Amino acid sequence: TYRYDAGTTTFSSDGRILQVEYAIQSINQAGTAIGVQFTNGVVLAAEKKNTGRLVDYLFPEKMAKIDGHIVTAVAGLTADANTLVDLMRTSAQKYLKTYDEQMPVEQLVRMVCDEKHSYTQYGGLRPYGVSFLIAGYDRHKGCQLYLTDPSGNFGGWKATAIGENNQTAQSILKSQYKDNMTATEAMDLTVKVLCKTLSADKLEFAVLQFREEYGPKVRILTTSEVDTLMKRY
Amino acid sequence: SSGADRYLTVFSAEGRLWQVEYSFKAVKQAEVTAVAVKSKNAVCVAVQKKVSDKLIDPSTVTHMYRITDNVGACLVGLPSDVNFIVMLLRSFANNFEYKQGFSIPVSILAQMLSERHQLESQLVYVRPSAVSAILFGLDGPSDSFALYKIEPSGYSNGFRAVACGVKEIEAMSALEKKMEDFETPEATAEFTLSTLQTVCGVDFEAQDVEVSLLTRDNSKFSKLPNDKVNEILHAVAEK
Amino acid sequence: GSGYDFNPITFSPDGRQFQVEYATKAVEKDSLALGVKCKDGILLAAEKNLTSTLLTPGGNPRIFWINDSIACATIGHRPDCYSIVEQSRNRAETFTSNFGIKITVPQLASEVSQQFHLAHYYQAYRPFGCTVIFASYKDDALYAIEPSGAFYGYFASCFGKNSNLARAELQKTEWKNITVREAVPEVARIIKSLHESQFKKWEIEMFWLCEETNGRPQKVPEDVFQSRFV
Amino acid sequence: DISTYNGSCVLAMAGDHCVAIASDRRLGVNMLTVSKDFKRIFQINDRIYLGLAGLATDVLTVREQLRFDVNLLELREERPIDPKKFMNLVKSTLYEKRFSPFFVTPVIAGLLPETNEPYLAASDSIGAFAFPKDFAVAGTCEESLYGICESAWRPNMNPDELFECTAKCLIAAVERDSISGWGGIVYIITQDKVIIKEIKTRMD
Amino acid sequence: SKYDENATTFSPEGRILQVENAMKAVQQGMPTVGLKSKTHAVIAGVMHSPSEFSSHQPKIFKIDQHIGVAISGLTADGRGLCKFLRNECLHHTFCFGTEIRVADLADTVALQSQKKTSKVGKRPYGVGLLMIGAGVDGPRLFETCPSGQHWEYNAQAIGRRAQAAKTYLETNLNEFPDCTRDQLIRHALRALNDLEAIALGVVGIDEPFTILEGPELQKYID
Amino acid sequence: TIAAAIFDGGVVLGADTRATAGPIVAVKDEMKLHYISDNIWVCGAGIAADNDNINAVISAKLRLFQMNTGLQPRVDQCTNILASRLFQYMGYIQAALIVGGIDFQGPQVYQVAPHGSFSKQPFIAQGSGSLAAISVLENRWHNKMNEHDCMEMVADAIYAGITNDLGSGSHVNLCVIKRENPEDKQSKVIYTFYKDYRVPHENDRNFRLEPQINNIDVEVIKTTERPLT
Amino acid sequence: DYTRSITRFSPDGRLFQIDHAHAAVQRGTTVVATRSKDMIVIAVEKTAVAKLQDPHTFSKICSLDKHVMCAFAGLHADARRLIQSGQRQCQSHRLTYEDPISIENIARYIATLQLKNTQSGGARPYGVSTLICGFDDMTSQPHIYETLPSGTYAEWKARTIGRHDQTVMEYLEKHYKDDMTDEEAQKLAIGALLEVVENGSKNLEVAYMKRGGTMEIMAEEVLDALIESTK
Amino acid sequence: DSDFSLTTFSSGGKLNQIESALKAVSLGGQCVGVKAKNGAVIACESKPSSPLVEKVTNLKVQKINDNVGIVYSGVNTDFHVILKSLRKASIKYSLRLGVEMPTREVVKHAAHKMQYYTQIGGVRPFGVSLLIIGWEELGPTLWQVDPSGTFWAWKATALGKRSDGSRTFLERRYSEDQSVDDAIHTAISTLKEGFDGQLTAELIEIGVVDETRKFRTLSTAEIRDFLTE
Ligand SMILES: *C(=O)[C@H]1N[C@](C)(CO)[C@](C)([C@H](Cc2ccccc2)NC(=O)[C@H](Cc2c[nH]c3ccccc23)NC(=O)[C@H](Cc2c[nH]c3ccccc23)NC(=O)CCCCC)O[C@@H]1C
C-alpha cells in the first residue's frame, strides 16, 4: 500500500532526493573528516563520534583501510559507513583478484558511489548516510583524495572536509593548503584545520604515503601517534 | 512523523512496539485464562474452556494442543492465531525431529516460537501472532518437566508456574503467592485448578476447563478426561 | 479503528483486527447458510436470495464439492467464498498427494484456516470475507471457518443474515436424533421463517452428505425438497 | 591427466625457528617446458608463504582467492593472518570446491607469530591438511620428496642447513620428476628475514 | 472514501470499495444482453462507437468453439481475461481433449478477478463478462463480475441502459427455455436497443458459437 | 583403522594416525578422532578432507545447538545430523564415521556410512583396517566391560588394523568418553584423549644413516634477502 | 523487491517525477553540443572548483565508445549509471553486430534507460539529460542526440542541457550556421557557454570528436585561444 | 510491497526509527559493562517478570563463543535473534579459520546485522544495544553495538533503564587499573545505582572475560560471593 513508504528513491519538487539531502544533513552533523593531498600521499583526519573519558579508543571509528593503497575517512553514520567499507574492501580485493593490480582509487570510489546511488535510485531503501574521504594511490593518478556523498556523487579534492563545520575546514584549507606539501606539512595542516574547526583522543588520523620502492602504504595513526601529532601542534 | 509505529511492528518515539502490545490485548480477547503449574513430579496446565454456542462441538473448542507426543501447548488468544501457532509449533517440532532425530524439547520449541514472534515484531509485513503459548512437557534428557511461556512479543521464559489470558495478572499473583514444590502430581493438578478457579471466580466443572496433567507415569501430552478433571475439582472443593 | 482498520495485519489498540471483522461483516450481510449434523447425515442448507429473477434456478451455488465426501457451504463475499472453496479443494488434493488419503473436515478446516489466517497475518493480503462450513458425513464433521480463520466443529453451524435467529432455531432441534430427510423440512422451516420478504423469488440450495449419498456431497433432489420459492 | 598437466614440486621444511619452502620453477604443459620462471610459492604475509603445487591455472586461482581472503581478513582484523588461521582458510578454500576440486595442493610454510616456531601445513587438493613438524611435500614429485626428505630431514636445521636440505632434497626430487624442475627457488623464512635463494637444478 | 484505495481493503460495512468501483466501470460499459434457452444461448451487445467514423469496437468475442464472451467495461482487461480464457480452454483440451465448459471458464475468471482483489498491487478487472457456452452441461450464460464472482443467468443485461433490457428479459424469461435459436436471437435484439452497432454471438448444443453483425443479423432484427 | 566400543561407563573411540595419498603415507600422525562436543567424538575413515569437514561441520552445528538451546548434544542427534548430511551428498562425502558419545541415554557408538546409513552398535570398526579391528572387537567386546578393558580392546583393534591393513598405520589414538563420576549417571560427560595411546615400537624407523651421504651440490643462481616485514 | 509506481501521471496528464528529474537536470551544469560537417564539439561548464579541487578526470564529458562522445547535465551519479549502461551497450552492439552502434541507436538506448526508470516500479527517473554525439561511420554525418529524463531523445544541429539551457540554446539559435567548420563549431559551443560562465578559461571545458576519431579534450592553450577569438 | 526502508532520514538528517530503537534500548533493562586491566565484565539487571520465572531459561548475559560474551539492553527477543546470528557467525568463522571469531569481529558482525536491519525494507531496527566483552591482542575490550549498527569500544558503560545515571556513576567510579574482581564489583555497584530495591544475585547476571581470555557467566553463587565480598 506504501502508506508509510517514504519514497526514498523519489525526486522532490526541487529535483532533489529528499532522503539523500537528509543523509547529507546527517553527515554535516557528524564528526569532521578532513583530507589533505600532499606530494606523495594523503592525510585523512576524522573526529571520533564516540568519545569521552569512559570510551576506549581501541579502533578507528571513522578511519578504514580499504586496501594497501586506499584508506577512507567517514563522516556521518559509522554503521552504513562500515557496510560501505566492507563493500569497498571486497571490491578492491575483487579488482586485485581479477587484474592482479591494486584497484585504481577512482574505480573503488566509483564502486562505493554506485552502491550509494543504487540506493538513491532503486529499491525504496534509505540511502547510505555516509560521506567518504577516500584517499588512495594508483599508478594512473598518483595519490588521490575523493569526497563521496550519499547521492553517489564523488569528486577529487587536493584538500577537502566533511562533517561538522566542514565549511570552516574548507575555508582554512583554501587559506593554508599548498601544492607539493610534505607528509609532515599536510599532517600539520590537517591537525590545524581539525583544531580550528573543533583533543588527540577524539581525533584519529590515517596517512596514505607512496614511496617509490615500498609502494603505497596506509597507516592509520593509533592513539599514541595521534597524541604525538597533536602535541607537535 | 508518520504513524507506522502504531500500525506496524516498528518502534514508536517511546521505543515501544505498539502492535506487540496490541497482540497482547488480542491474546486477552480469548476470554479464557490458563494456569500452568510445573512441580518436580508433574506439570498441570488448566485453561478454562468457554464454548459460545451449544451448537459448537465442544471437542473443537480447545486451547490445549498436542505439539508432539511429549510437548503440549496451551495456547490462549485469537482462535485463528491459536490455530496458526498450533500448526507452527507442530511444524517446528517436526522439523526439529527431522533435522536432529529426536522429539523437540519444550525449551527449544519455546525458543522457536519466540523467534517467530520476533520476526513478527520485527518484520513490518508480519503481524504479531496474538498467542500466549504455555508449552509444557517432560523433557527426557533432563527427565524434568519443562514449562515455558512465550508471549506474543516472543518473550519466552521457563516457569515453575505461569498464567496466560484475561486473568494472567491475578493468576500469576496467586501462583507466586501460593506455589509449592508439590510432592505428587495430584497436588500439582489440585493447585493448578484451584488457582484457575479462584482467579476466574467461578467454580469449575470438568466441561468448563481443559486440564493436561503430564506426569512421569503419563509423560505424553493429553487433555485429562472429564472424570479425572472432576476428581481434581472435587479435591479442590474438599478444602 | 482510528487508522487501525486499513491494514489487515494491524491490531487495534484493543487487539481487534478491524479488517478481519469487516470481512466478518461481509459474511453477516450474505444470505444465511446453515449446516446441521443429522443422524443419517449432514445437511447443508444455503438461502439464496435471488437478486434478479433471471438467475438460473439451478445455478449460483452456495454449496460446493470439496471431495467425494466433503461439501462446503459458503457465506459472505462470493468471490472469497469460491476462492476459499478452490483453495480447500487444492488443500484436499495436496493432502492426498502428500499422504495418499482423503483429508478430513477437521484437517481441511485447519489447513484452510491457515489461508484465512495468512490473509490477515502477512501483509498484502485481504481477509477472506467469507465463512466456509465444511460438512463430511464420513468424518461426521461440520466445521465452519470464519473470516479470521477461527474454525470450529459444530453440531449445527449457521452464518449470514439472521444467523443468530437461525442458530436459536437450530438449537430447538436435536439434529443428531433425526435424519437428513426429516431434517430438510425443519431446516427449510427455519430458513423460511427467517427469510426476508424483500426477495419474492428465492431458493434454498440444500446439499446433504448422508447414508443415502454414501457420504457424497449431493444437492438434495428437488423431489425430496423443492428449493424454488416465489 | 590434469594433475600432472603442470609438473610441480613444492617442498616446505622445518628448521630451528626457520622454515623453508622451495619450488621448481618450471611451467610445463605436460611434457613441454613453457617457462622456467613459474611462481608456485607466494608470500601470504611476512611470516606465511604458500607453495601451490599443481595446475598453474589452479595455482594462480587459489593464490589469488587466498590473497583475496587474507587481504579481507587482515583489513577487517587489522592484523596479519596467523599460519594456523591461514591454514584453515586454505582448507576452507579447497573444500569449498570439494565437488570440483582445485588441482592444486598447498604447502604452507610459516613462522608462528609468537614463538617463531616452524609451521608446515600440507594438504591434498580438497584441504585435508597434514601438519608435519619435519617437511611438507606437494606436486608431481610428491613421492620423491617424501623419500628424500624422510631420510634427509634432521631436527634443528639452522637457516643455512635448512636451505641446504631444501635445495638438495628438492633437486633430488625434481631431477627424478620429468615434468617438474628447470631451476628451484627456496624461501627461507627465519625469525627476522626471508632469504630467497634461486638454486640450480637440472634444466632437462 | 478513505477505505476506497485498495481492492484489498474492506470497508467498515464489509465492502471492497475498489471492487465496487471496477463494478461501476462495468456498469458504464455498453449494453450487453444474454439469453439462454434449453438448446441455445445468445449474447447481443451494442458495440461501442468512440466516433462516427470509428467501426464499433468488438465486444462479442469468440473464446471456444462453443463459448463466447461479451465484455463490458475495460476492453483491455476483457482482452487479458480472454487470453486467460484461451489458456484455460487450451489446457482443458490438452488434458481431456474436450471443450472446457463455460461454467468452468466462469469459475476461472471469477478466481482470477478474486485474486486481483485479494492481493495488493493488483487491481480488479474493470471488465465484466457475459459468457455463453453450449457444452455437455447444456447452454449456460454466466455474468462474471470484477469482484471475482459469476452468476449463472437464464438471461441478463449489463452495462448502461441495462435496466430496461433486464425488465424485458424478465417479461419473456419463461418463454426463453423453449424458444428457438432464431427466437432467442430475436429476443436478444429486442432486449438490446442500440443495428450495425449490435453484434450477436449465438451458440447451441449442436451449433458452434458464431458471431452475427449487421447484415448477418438482419434476418433476425425484425 | 578406526573403531569405537562401549564399556560400562562410556565409550572408547580409537583410530590409527596414517593418512594415505594413494599408496604413499601422506600423514603419519593424522588426527582422525575429532571432538564433536564434550560428550561426542567422531573417528573417521574415508577421504581425509571429507571426514575433517563433516566432523567440523557437525561439531559446529552441535556447538551452536548447545549454546542456543543449552542442551548437551545427543549421540543419536549427532549421528542423525551426520547421516542426513552424508545422505544428501549420496555418498560423495566419503566419511565413514564412528560417533561415540554419552548422553542421557548412556554411552552410544554409532556408525555412519558415507552414503548416510547409520547404526547404533556396541562396537564398530570402520576404514580399510576395519576387518582386522572388528575381529579384535568381536572376540574381546562384552557387555559392561570396564574402561581399561575397552581401552585395551579398542587400541588392540586399531593396532590390528595398523599391523594387517596397509591403509592403516602409525600410532593408536584413543578417546574415552566417560562420566566424571561412574556411580552417578547424571555426572558430567568428560572425554580423555590419549594421543599416541599405542606407539608400536616395531613400526618405528629402526635405521637412519645419520651422516647422510649427499653428492648433490647446491648452486645458488640468485640470493635475495628481505626483512620479515 | 520494491516496485512502487514512483513515476505516475498527475490528474493534468503529467508525470511529475519526470518534471522533478528535469529540475535535477536544470540544477546540473550546462553542456552545449555543436556539430560541424566533420566534427562534434561538447563544451561543458566546469562546476565552481576551489583551489582544493582536482580539475582532471571529473569532466561531465565522456566517451560511450570510440565513436560516441557523451556529456550530461543533472545528477552526476545518475549520469554515471547511464554512461556505464551506454558503454556496456556500445560494446554489446559491437559484440552482437560487428558495426559500431549508431548514434541514433545508443541515444535511443540511453533514452530508453531513462524511459524504463520512468516506467519501472520502484525506480527513480534519471535526473539526467544526456547529449550523446558521434559518427555512425566514416561517411556518416555527425549526430548530436539529446535524451531527457522522460526518456525522449531527439537529434539536434546544436543543443544545450543543464542550467542556462534557455540562454545557451538562444545563443546557439542566434549563432548557428548550416555548414559550420570545425573551428566555427568550436567557437559556437565555446561562446554559447561563455555567455553564462563567470570565467571563460576556468569554468569551461571542451571535448571534440573529429570525423574518424575518438573523444578529444581541448588543450587549455587552444581552448584559451578559441575563447579569446570568440571575445 | 515490503522492501522499502521504514528506517529513513527525517528532515534533520536523523533516522527516527534508529532513535526509536535506541529508546526501546533505554527502556530495556539496565546492563553494565566494565573493562578491567586483565579482563572485562558485562553485568545486567535480570529482574524476572515473576519469581516463577526460571532465570537460566532466559539469560541476558550470553556467550557468543569461548572468548566473546554478550549482554543487551532492549528487546529480549531480537537480542536472541542477534545472539543466534552472532553465535552462528562465530561458528562459521571457526569453520572457515579454525579459531573463535575475534571480539572485534563479533562486534563488527553484530553491528553489520543491526545496520542491515536499519537499511533494508520491511523491518525495524533491532531494539537492543549489545555490550560485547572479549579479549584482543592488546587486552580486554568492551564494545557497544547500537540498534543502528554503530559499534564502539568502551571502558565502562550502561545501556538500559537509568543508563545515563549509571554511565555518570561509572565515569566517577571506574578506574583503568581495575582487576576483573574490581570490574565485577564496579558492575554490581552500577547495577545497584540503576536498580531500586534490594539488588540480589538472582536479579543480576554477570559475564566475565578474564586473564584466561575465555568468557564465563558467573553463577548465582559467584554473584552472591561478589555481593558479600
Ligand atoms: C583404517 O582403515 C584407516 N584407513 C585410512 C586410509 C586412514 O589413513 C582412513 C580410511 C583414512 C581416513 C582419514 C580420516 C581423517 C583424516 C585422515 C584420514 N583415509 C585417508 O587417509 C584417505 C584415503 C582415501 C583417499 N580417497 C578415498 C576415497 C574413499 C575412501 C578413502 C579414501 N586419504 C585422503 O583422503 C588423502 C589425504 C592426503 C593426501 N595427500 C595429503 C597431503 C597432506 C595431508 C593429507 C593428504 N587425500 C586424497 O586422497 C585426496 C582426495 C581427493 C578427493 C576429491 O582412515 C582409517 C582410520
B196 in Cβ contact with B35 (< 8 Å)? yes
Q: How far is D64 from chain A (nearest CA, A)?
A: 5
- Residue-by-residue DSSP string for F7-66: ETTEEEEEEE--EEETTEEEESS----EEEETTEEEEEEE-HHHHHHHHHHHHHHHHHHH
User: Which residue shows C-alpha cell 545422505?
Assistant: F87
Which residues neighbour F102 within 8 Å (Cβ) at sequence distance 6 or greater? F10, F11, F39, F75, F108, F177, F178, F179, F189
Residue H87 burial (CB count, 10 A): 23
Which residues neighbour H60 within 8 Å (Cβ) at sequence distance 6 or greater? H29, H31, H44, H46, H71, H72, H76, H79, H205
Using DSSP's 3-state secondary structure scheme, residue B214 falls into strand
Q: Does C132 touch chain B (CB under 8 A)?
A: no
Q: Does F52 touch chain D (CB under 8 A)?
A: yes
Q: Does C152 touch chain B (CB under 8 A)?
A: yes
Q: Do chains D and C touch (3 or more CB pairs under 8 A)?
A: no
Could you tell me the maximum CA-CA distance found in chain B, to the nearest angstrom?
60
Would you call H119 and A78 a contact, using CB atoms and an 8 Å cutoff? no
Distance between CA H83 and CA H73 in Å, rounded?
13
Distance between CA G131 and CA G189 in Å, rounded?
13
What's the count of helices (H) and strands (E) in chain D, helices before strands?
4, 12
DSSP-derived letter for residue F203 is G
Residue F22 burial (CB count, 10 A): 8
Distance between CA H121 and CA A4 in Å, rounded?
11
Residue A122 burial (CB count, 10 A): 19
Using DSSP's 3-state secondary structure scheme, residue H122 falls into coil
Nearest CA-CA partner of G144 in G186, G182, G106, G116: G106
End-to-end CA distance of chain B: 58
Q: How far is the CA of D146 from the centre of ligand 1 (A)?
A: 17
Distance between CA E219 and CA G118 in Å, rounded?
53
* C156, β-bridge pairs: C36
Q: Give CB contacts under 8 A, 24+ apart, made by E172-178.
A: E173/C53, E173/C54, E176/E35, E176/E36, E176/E37, E177/E36, E177/E37, E177/E38, E178/E37, E178/E38
Q: How many CA atoms lie within 13 A of C180 on its CB side?
A: 29
Residue nearest to atom 46 of ligand 1 (CA): D124
Q: How far is the CA of C151 from the centre of ligand 1 (A)?
A: 59
Q: Does H56 touch chain F (CB under 8 A)?
A: yes
Q: How far is the CA of F47 from the centre of ligand 1 (A)?
A: 4
Residue nearest to atom 41 of ligand 1 (CA): D124
Residue H138 burial (CB count, 10 A): 8
Neighbors of chain C with 3 or more C-beta pairs under 8 Å: A, B, E, H
* Surface-to-core class of residue A43, CB atoms within 10 Å of its CB (0-12 exposed, 13-18 middle, 19+ buried): buried
F16 lines ligand 1 (CB under 6 A): yes
Q: What angle do CA C222, C226, C227 make, to 5 degrees?
A: 105
A103 in Cβ contact with A95 (< 8 Å)? yes
Q: How many residues does chain H have?
A: 229
Phi-psi group of D78: left, alpha or beta (phi > 0 → left; psi -120 to 50 → alpha; rest → beta) = left
Residue nearest to atom 31 of ligand 1 (CA): F46
Residue nearest to atom 50 of ligand 1 (CA): D124
Which residues neighbour F211 within 8 Å (Cβ) at sequence distance 6 or greater? none
The H-or-E segment that residue C117 falls in is helix C105-121
F210: cell is 645419520
Which residues neighbour F139 within 8 Å (Cβ) at sequence distance 6 or greater? none
Distance between CA F151 and CA F155 in Å, rounded?
6
Distance of CA F89 to the CA centre of its chain: 21
Distance between CA B10 and CA B4 in Å, rounded?
7
Residue B203 burial (CB count, 10 A): 11
Distance between CA D166 and CA B50 in Å, rounded?
85
E19 interaction partners in chain C (CB closer than 8 Å): 79
Nearest CA-CA partner of F136 in F147, F146, F125: F125
User: Which residue shows C-alpha cell 517467530?
Assistant: B116
A80 in Cβ contact with A130 (< 8 Å)? yes
Mutation target for F interface from B71, B92, B100: give the one with most F CBs within 10 A.
B100
E15 interaction partners in chain C (CB closer than 8 Å): 26
Cα–Cα separations (whole angstroms), residue A6 to A9, E189, G104, G124, H6 = 9, 55, 37, 13, 7
Runs of H (alpha helix) within G43-163 = 76-96, 103-119
Would you call C152 and B56 a contact, using CB atoms and an 8 Å cutoff? yes
Chain H residue whose CA is closest to G4 = H1
Picking from B4, B118, B176, the nearest residue to H52 by CB comes out as B176
F67 lines ligand 1 (CB under 6 A): no
Q: Does G119 touch chain A (CB under 8 A)?
A: no
- Return the amino acid letter for B123: L
Q: How far is A1 from chain E (nearest CA, A)?
A: 7
Mutation choice for ligand 1 from F18, F20, F134, CB with most ligand atoms inside 8 A? F20
Nearest CA-CA partner of B124 in A125, H112, C121: C121
Backbone angles phi, psi at F11, to 5 degrees: -125, 140
Mutation target for D interface from H90, H91, H93, H96: give the one with most D CBs within 10 A.
H96
Q: How far is B82 from chain A (nearest CA, A)?
A: 27
Q: How far is the CA of A43 from the centre of ligand 1 (A)?
A: 53
Distance between CA C142 and CA C134 in Å, rounded?
6
Q: How far is C148 from chain B (nearest CA, A)?
A: 6
Picking from G56, G57, G77, the nearest residue to A117 by CB comes out as G77
* D121, β-bridge pairs: D108
The H-or-E segment that residue G143 falls in is strand G142-147
Residue nearest to atom 24 of ligand 1 (CA): F47
Distance of CA C12 to the CA centre of its chain: 28
Backbone angles phi, psi at A221, to 5 degrees: -60, 135
Cα–Cα separations (whole angstroms), residue G138 to E87, G108, G135, G143, G154 = 52, 21, 7, 12, 22
D126 lines ligand 1 (CB under 6 A): yes
A106 interaction partners in chain G (CB closer than 8 Å): 57
Closest atom, ligand 1, to C-alpha of F34: 15
Q: What is the 3-state secondary structure (H, E, C) of A81-97?
A: HHHHHHHHHHHHHHHHH
Mutation target for E interface from C24, C28, C54, C88: give the one with most E CBs within 10 A.
C54
A86 interaction partners in chain D (CB closer than 8 Å): 76
- Return the amino acid letter for F134: I
What's the count of helices (H) and strands (E) in chain E, helices before strands?
6, 10
- Return the amino acid letter for H59: L
Buried b (16+ CB within 10 A) or exposed e, D32-49: ebeeeebbbbbbbbbbbb
Cα–Cα separations (whole angstroms), residue F48 to F19, F30, F33, F154, G195 = 7, 9, 11, 21, 77
A111 in Cβ contact with A88 (< 8 Å)? yes
